[PDB]
Amino acid sequence: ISVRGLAGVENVTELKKNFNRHLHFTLVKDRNVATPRDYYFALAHTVRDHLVGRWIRTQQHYYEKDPKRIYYLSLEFYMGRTLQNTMVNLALENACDEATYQLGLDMEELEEIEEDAGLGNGGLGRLAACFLDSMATLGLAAYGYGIRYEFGIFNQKICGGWQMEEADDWLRYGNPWEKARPEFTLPVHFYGRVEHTSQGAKWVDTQVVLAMPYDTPVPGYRNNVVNTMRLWSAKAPNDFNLGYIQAVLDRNLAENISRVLYPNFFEGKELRLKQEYFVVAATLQDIIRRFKSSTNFDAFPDKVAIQLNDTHPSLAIPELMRVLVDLERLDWDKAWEVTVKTCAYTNHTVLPEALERWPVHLLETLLPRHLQIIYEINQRFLNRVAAAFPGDVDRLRRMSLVEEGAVKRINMAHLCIAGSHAVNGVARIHSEILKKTIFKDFYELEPHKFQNKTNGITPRRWLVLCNPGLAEIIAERIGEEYISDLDQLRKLLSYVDDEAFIRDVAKVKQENKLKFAAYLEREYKVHINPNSLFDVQVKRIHEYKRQLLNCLHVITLYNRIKKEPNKFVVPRTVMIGGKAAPGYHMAKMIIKLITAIGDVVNHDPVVGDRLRVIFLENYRVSLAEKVIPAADLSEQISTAGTEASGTGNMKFMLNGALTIGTMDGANVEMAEEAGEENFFIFGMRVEDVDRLDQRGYNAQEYYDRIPELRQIIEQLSSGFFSPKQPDLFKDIVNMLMHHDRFKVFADYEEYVKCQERVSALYKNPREWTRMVIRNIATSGKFSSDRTIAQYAREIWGVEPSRQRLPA
Amino acid sequence: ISVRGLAGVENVTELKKNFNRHLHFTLVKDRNVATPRDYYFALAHTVRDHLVGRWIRTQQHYYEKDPKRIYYLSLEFYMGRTLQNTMVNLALENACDEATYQLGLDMEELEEIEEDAGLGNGGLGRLAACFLDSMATLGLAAYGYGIRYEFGIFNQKICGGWQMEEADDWLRYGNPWEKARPEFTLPVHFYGRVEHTSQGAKWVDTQVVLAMPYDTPVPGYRNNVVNTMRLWSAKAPNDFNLGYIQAVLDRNLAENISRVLYPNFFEGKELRLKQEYFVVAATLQDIIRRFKSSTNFDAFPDKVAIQLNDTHPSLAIPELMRVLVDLERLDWDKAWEVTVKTCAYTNHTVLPEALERWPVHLLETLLPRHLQIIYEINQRFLNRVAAAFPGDVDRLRRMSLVEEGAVKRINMAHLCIAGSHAVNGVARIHSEILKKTIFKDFYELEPHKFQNKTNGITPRRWLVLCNPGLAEIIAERIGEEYISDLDQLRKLLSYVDDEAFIRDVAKVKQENKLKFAAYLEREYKVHINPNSLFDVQVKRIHEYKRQLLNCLHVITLYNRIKKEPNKFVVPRTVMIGGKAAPGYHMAKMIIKLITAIGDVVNHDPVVGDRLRVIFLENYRVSLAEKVIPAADLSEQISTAGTEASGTGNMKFMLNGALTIGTMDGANVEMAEEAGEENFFIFGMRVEDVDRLDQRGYNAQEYYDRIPELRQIIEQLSSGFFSPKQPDLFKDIVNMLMHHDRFKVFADYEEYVKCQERVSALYKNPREWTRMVIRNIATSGKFSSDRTIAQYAREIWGVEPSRQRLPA
Ligand SMILES: OC[C@H]1CNC[C@@H](O)[C@@H]1O
Numbered sequence A, B: 001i002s003v004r005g006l007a008g009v010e011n012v013t014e015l016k017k018n019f020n021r022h023l024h025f026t027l028v029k030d031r032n033v034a035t036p037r038d039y040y041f042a043l044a045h046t047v048r049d050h051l052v053g054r055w056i057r058t059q060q061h062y063y064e065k066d067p068k069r070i071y072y073l074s075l076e077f078y079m080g081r082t083l084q085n086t087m088v089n090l091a092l093e094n095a096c097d098e099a100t101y102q103l104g105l106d107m108e109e110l111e112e113i114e115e116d117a118g119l120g121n122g123g124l125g126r127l128a129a130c131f132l133d134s135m136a137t138l139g140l141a142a143y144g145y146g147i148r149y150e151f152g153i154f155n156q157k158i159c160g161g162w163q164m165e166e167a168d169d170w171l172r173y174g175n176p177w178e179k180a181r182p183e184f185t186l187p188v189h190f191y192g193r194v195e196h197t198s199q200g201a202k203w204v205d206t207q208v209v210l211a212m213p214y215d216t217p218v219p220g221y222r223n224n225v226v227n228t229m230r231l232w233s234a235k236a237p238n239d240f241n242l243g244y245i246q247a248v249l250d251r252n253l254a255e256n257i258s259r260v261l262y263p264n265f266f267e268g269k270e271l272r273l274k275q276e277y278f279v280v281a282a283t284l285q286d287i288i289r290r291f292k293s294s295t296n297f298d299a300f301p302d303k304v305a306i307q308l309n310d311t312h313p314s315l316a317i318p319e320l321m322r323v324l325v326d327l328e329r330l331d332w333d334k335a336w337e338v339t340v341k342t343c344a345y346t347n348h349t350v351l352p353e354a355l356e357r358w359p360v361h362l363l364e365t366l367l368p369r370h371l372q373i374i375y376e377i378n379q380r381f382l383n384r385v386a387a388a389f390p391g392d393v394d395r396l397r398r399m400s401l402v403e404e405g406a407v408k409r410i411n412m413a414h415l416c417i418a419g420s421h422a423v424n425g426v427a428r429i430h431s432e433i434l435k436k437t438i439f440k441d442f443y444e445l446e447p448h449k450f451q452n453k454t455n456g457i458t459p460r461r462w463l464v465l466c467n468p469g470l471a472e473i474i475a476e477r478i479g480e481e482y483i484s485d486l487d488q489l490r491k492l493l494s495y496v497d498d499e500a501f502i503r504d505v506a507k508v509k510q511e512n513k514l515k516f517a518a519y520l521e522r523e524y525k526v527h528i529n530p531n532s533l534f535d536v537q538v539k540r541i542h543e544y545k546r547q548l549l550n551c552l553h554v555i556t557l558y559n560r561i562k563k564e565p566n567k568f569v570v571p572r573t574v575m576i577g578g579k580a581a582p583g584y585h586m587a588k589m590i591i592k593l594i595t596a597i598g599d600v601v602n603h604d605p606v607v608g609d610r611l612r613v614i615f616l617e618n619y620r621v622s623l624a625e626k627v628i629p630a631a632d633l634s635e636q637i638s639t640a641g642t643e644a645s646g647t648g649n650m651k652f653m654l655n656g657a658l659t660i661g662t663m664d665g666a667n668v669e670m671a672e673e674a675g676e677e678n679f680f681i682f683g684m685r686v687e688d689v690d691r692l693d694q695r696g697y698n699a700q701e702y703y704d705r706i707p708e709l710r711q712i713i714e715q716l717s718s719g720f721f722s723p724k725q726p727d728l729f730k731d732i733v734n735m736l737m738h739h740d741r742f743k744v745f746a747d748y749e750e751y752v753k754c755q756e757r758v759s760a761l762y763k764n765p766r767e768w769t770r771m772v773i774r775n776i777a778t779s780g781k782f783s784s785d786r787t788i789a790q791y792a793r794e795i796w797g798v799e800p801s802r803q804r805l806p807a
C-alpha cells in the first residue's frame, strides 16, 4: 500500500487470530462489550508479541558476543506513543492495517487512544528518545537508564486564557509495553554517616530504598535488534518504619522518589537530589553486575561506556569511585583512571540559572560519603591546575568544584568535566561557546576532552511515522534506503526543476494542512483557513525562545491591516504552543498574552480570515507529529547565543517547512547545509549581542525610533488587549522596557522585514516549493543516526553496524 | 491418578504448549534464565486461561436470564492461594501435574511460591471466602464486594520469643488472578455539607475519591459457573489539590483508603470509617447500574439481595436511602420499604468491645447527609417502639440507634437490625443468645427477623485440596458425590468396624503427620517426634480463646513428668499458632509465654521427646492447610458463651482430629451430630458461667484448693520460665488472679482430667481411629454448601442449583 511494508495473506490471517486471542484471554472481553480502548490494547499486545522473540534473542546475543556496553543515563526520556513506531520498525504497519480493516476497525482511530509516555519536559528528553531509536538501528549494545515516573509532564489546560496544570496519570489504564522485573530489585542507600576503620571508610546507619526495574523494548529499524530501556521505580522495604497503621502509610515517603517528573531555573530541592542519586546508584549496581558476568577492573573501560546526559546523573562519578574504593578496595588512582575512562558528559545549555549547584549541607546529610569523595576529587584536581598554571590564584577559585559564598555549593558541571574523558556540546556554535567562555579554563587545562556532537532527530518517527505522504513520494524517486541513511535525500536535488515532484511536494503539504485543519475543528472546535500560510512556533514557553517577539510581529500585522483594510496581505494562521513551568510567572503571562491577542484578532470583522492567532493547547510529542507536517513556516527565533542546539528546527526542515531563524544553535548548520539563500535568517549574531551588552542595552532607544513598536507598547499598556483589566500586561511591558535579558526590541525591525520576505515568497507557490525541496534535500546531516555514529566512534570507541540479526 | 481428574493425552499436550507460550510471550523469559517463580507464573496464567471463557459465558448468562442478584458485602475476604483451588474446581489437577512433570517440574514446588491473598484477619474473612466458593458451586448469581487492600494481614515474625509485624506486600510480584477494570471507575464523596432546597436535600462541596474495581474469578466446583469478586481500589482524581509537586505527592492521602487492612477491641479511627463508606458507596452504584439494565424500584427487592457481613458495611442502609430519596426522588416510606426488603444482617459476636459505635462528631464531618438520615431512621423507629410498648421509657433509650453520654455515638448494630428484614447469628447457641440477651428488645418488637445460620467450611479447600489422601480413601468406598454433597459422608458409618478402612484412615493421618514433621524441619529447622499425639490450637491470640488454659495444661504435664520421670506418659507435640493484634499487649504476652515454656520444656533432658511445645509462626490459610490434616487433637476451649461459632473446629473434624472443647459456639452442634460420647467435652456450660458471675468470680479460691495450680502460678511469679527477667510474667499472673474475664481457673480441673481421657484413648490406636471415623462421618452439616443453601432459601429468596453450565 505504501512504504509501510507488505500485507501478506499468511501474516494478516495470523495477526487477526492473535488479536482475537488477546481480546478474549488477555483483556477478558467479548466483541459485544468491547470499546475502542479494548481494541487498542488488543492490537498493542499482538504487536508486542512480535518484539519479545527478538528482544530475548538480542539480549542473549550480547551475552555471548560480550561487546562493549553503552549506558545512557538520563532523568528524562520523552518517548511519546509506541504502537506505530513499533509497527514501522518491525515492518508490520500495512499488515496490521489490513488485519484491523478486516476485523472492521480503523487503525488510525485505535492509535489515538494510546497515551503519550511523557517522561520528559522537552528537547533533552526527546533527544534521549531519538538517541535510543538510533542506537538500536545502528546495532549498538545500548541501554537507556532512568526513572519510571508515575506522573510525567503535566497536562496543560487553558482556562480563561490561563494555563492550568493537570496530573498526567499515564499509567491509569496500564502500560502494555513495559515488563516489571521485581526479581531484579536492588537496594539504594540514603543518609547515614561515615565510619573510618582499619581498612578504609564505611557508610553506615543508612536508610534503604528499593529500586524495582521496569524494562521497555527499543526496536531498531528493520534489523531485528531490540534493546532495553530500564526505568527504576522506588519501593519501601518490608520492615520500613517497622502505630502499625502509620508505619504502613509512611511507606509513601520512600516511594515518593519516583512519583513525579520535575518540570523545567535551578531549584535545590531534596527530592530532586534523591531522584538523581536513586537512578545513579541502582544503575551502577546493574552495570557492575553485568560486567562481573563478562575481578580486574582494568578492563572496565573496555566493556563499559557511561554517558551522562546533562549534569543530572553527575553523582555517577563519585558513586563509581565509592564502589571501586570502598567496596572493591581498589587504590584511589586506579579507581580514578577507570572512572575518567568510562564516563563522558554532554552539556545542554549556557544559561547560568540552569547550572546545577547543590548546597553542601544537603549533600552532607543525604550523601555524606559522596561529599568526602567530592572534596578529595577537588583537592587532587586543583593540585593539577596549580602545577599547570603556577601562581594563578583566581583560576584556582574559578575552577574549583566547591563554590564558596553565603552557602557553600558543589558545581556539578565542574565535577563532570574533571571525571570524564569527553565533554561535548550539542551544536558547533554551542561547543565553541563552551571552549571560549563558560569552560575556557577547563579547555586550557585539557583541550583534548572537548568535542562537538550536533544533535539530530530520528527519521523514523519524524518522517516515516508522522508524514507517510512525503515519505512515499520520496521513496518513489530514490527508494527506501534513505530511512536509515538520510544523507541519500541529497539525491532529491536533481528533482528541484521536476514539475511532477514540485506538484507532489506541494500536494502532500496541502493534504497535511487540510488534515490538521480538520483535527483543530474536531478536537477543539476552532476554525482555520487551510489556504493560509501556517506560521508555527512550538516549544517550551521561555523568555529566551522569544514567543514575545512573535507576538510583536502578529500585532504589527493586525495594526497594518486595520490601517489599510482594503490592501492585500498574504493570509496567515499563526500557531503557538508549549508549556510554561508552573512557577515561571512571566511564561504564564506570555501564554495569557497570546490568547488575549487571539481574542482580539480572531473576532475582528475587518481582519476576516486573513489573520488568525491560535494557541496550541497541551503541546507534546503526539501533537508535534500532527502540526509539524502541516507547517509552512518554522519559527526558530531565540536570541543568538541562548539556544544550545534546538531539535524542533530539524523536524520542521525534514517535513517541508521553511525556517525563519536567528544564527543560533543548530540553525547555523542547517542554513550552512541548505545554503543561506534558502533560509530566512535575520537579526543579531552572537558578536552583535556581545557588542550590545558592552555598550549597555537600552530598550527605550528602540521604542523612541520605531513608531510601529511604540504603538504596540502603548496598546499593551493602555489595555487594548485587556479591556476589563487595563493593567493586566504591566509586568510584560515593564520587563521589555527595563529588564529584558533577551533583547526582544533589538531584533524587532529585521524580524518584521524578514517576515515580509517570507510573505512575498509565499505568493509564488512554485518558488516556495522549490526552496522547500532544497531544504528537505539537505536535512540529512540532522539524522540522529549521524549523531550517534559520531558518539560511537569518537567517544564510546565502538563501531555501528547496519547488519541484521536473524529473525 | 486420584480424585484429581483425568490426564488425557490431548489435554496434557495442550497445557504444555500454553505453558511455554506464557513463559515466552507473557513472562518474556527463556528456559535458561527462568526461576521456579517464573514457572509458577507460567502455570498460573495457563490455568487462568481456562477460567475466562467460562467467566465471560457465566456473566453473559446472568445478563440474559436476569436472575435475582446476591451482593455479599464484607471488608474482609481471606482467600489464601488460588492456583490449586482453581485446578480442583476445573478438574485440571492431574492434567497439570502430568504436563508439568513432563516439562521436568514439580507442581507442589511451584504451588508453594504463590503468596496468600491475606485480605482478612481470621474467621470472618475466611467465612466470606468459603461462602464465595459455595455460592458459585450452588449456581447462584452472587458477587463478593470489598476492598483491594494493598497490604493484607501482617506477616508475623517471632524474634526472641516476641511477635514482630512485617508489611504483607502481597502484590510485589503481581497478581495473575485479578483483572483491573479502570473503565468502570466510580466516584465516592466525602465531607461537604447539606443544602436544603425546593425539592429536597443536596449534598455539596464534597471531596471526590475514585473507586477503581479489580475483578477476580470465583469458580464453582465442576459446574462451569464462574462468579465475580470485585474489590475496589482508591484513586485520586486528576485535578486533586489542583506548589505543583506537593499537589501531586498529596494524592497519596486519598489513596490511603485502600492501603491497609485494619487488624482485629473497637477503635473509632477516621480512615476505617472512610474504608467502610468507600466500599458501600462504590458497590451500591454498581448494584443500581446493573439493576437499571434489568425505573420502578418496587421490583428492586425482587432482583437484589444485599448481605451485610457484620456491621462493617452498615452504611449501606442510609446510603441506599440517600440514593433513593435524594437522587431518585422516591418518598421516604417507599424507599424504606425497598431498603428493609433488600438488606440482611449477619451478627458475628457477643463481645461488647467488638460492637461498632461511631462518634456522632465524626459522621457529622465525614458524612453529614448520612447522619441526618440516621437520625430520621431512629425517630421513626422509636415511634414504633413507643406505640408497641407505651410508657416503657427505658426500652426507648436501650433501643435507640443514638447512644448518649460523654460522646454521642451511633450504634451500628441497632441500625442494621432496624434496616434489615433478617438478622442471623452464626450458630444455634449464638443466635439464641442474641434473642435472649443482647438484642432481646429487638426480638420482642420483631420476632420474625431473627434467624440462625450455622457456619460451615468448603469441603473443596478443606478436604480435597489439603487432604487428598483422605479424600481418595473416602472416594474408593462411597464415590465422589460427597464433594458437593457432604451429607453423603454418613455412609462411612457402615465402615466403622471395617478393618481395611480403619487401617487406611490411620495410615493417611500418619502420612500427614510425617509430611508436616518434615516441613517443620525443612522450613524452620525444628525437630518433632511424629509418633506423638499432635495436640494443636491454631487461631487468633485472644484471652477469650484461652490459649492460656492450654499453657496451664502444658505446664501441668511438664511438672508431672519432673515429679515422676520414670513413669510412662503418652508423648505429645503441642502446637499453638496465631497472630496477636499489634496493640493488644496481653495477647503479645501470651505468645511470649508460649515460647518461654517451649524454651524450658524442649531442652529438659529428663522430658526427652515425650513432650514438645512449638509455637507455629505466621499462621494463615496456607499454613492451616498443612497443620489441620496433621492434627490428632483439636483444641476448641473458649469460655462458654464467648465464641459465636468457630470454623476452625469444623476443619479439624473433617480432617480426622478429635475435639477437646467446651459447649460453645458450633462445638455444641458438632458434638450433637457425632454424639457426645465421640467428643471430649469439658467445663462450664453458659448457665454455669452466669451462675459464677452472679456469685462473683474469685480466682483465689481455685488457687487455694488446687495444689497443682498453685505450683504453676508460683513458677510463673518467681521467674521459673524467665530466669533473666523474674517478673516478666507479672501482668499475666495478676490478670489471672484478679482481672480474668474469661475464668481460666474455673475450667482448669475438668480440662486437665478430660485431657487424661484423651491420652488414655490415644494408647488404643484402633479405638481412637474408630471414634475419628465417627467424627468424619457426621461432619456433613458443616459444609458451607448447607449454610449457603439456607441463606438462599430462608433469607435471599432464591433456589440453589447443581445444574452445570455448558463448557
Ligand atoms: O540538547 C537537547 C536540547 C537541550 N535544551 C536546549 C536545546 O537547545 C537542546 O536542543
Ligand SMILES: OC[C@H]1CNC[C@@H](O)[C@@H]1O
Pocket: B123, B124, B127, B348, B349, B426, B455, B643, B644, B645, B646, B647, B665
Ligand atoms: O462467623 C465467623 C467467625 C466470626 N468471629 C467469631 C467466630 O466465632 C466466628 O466463627
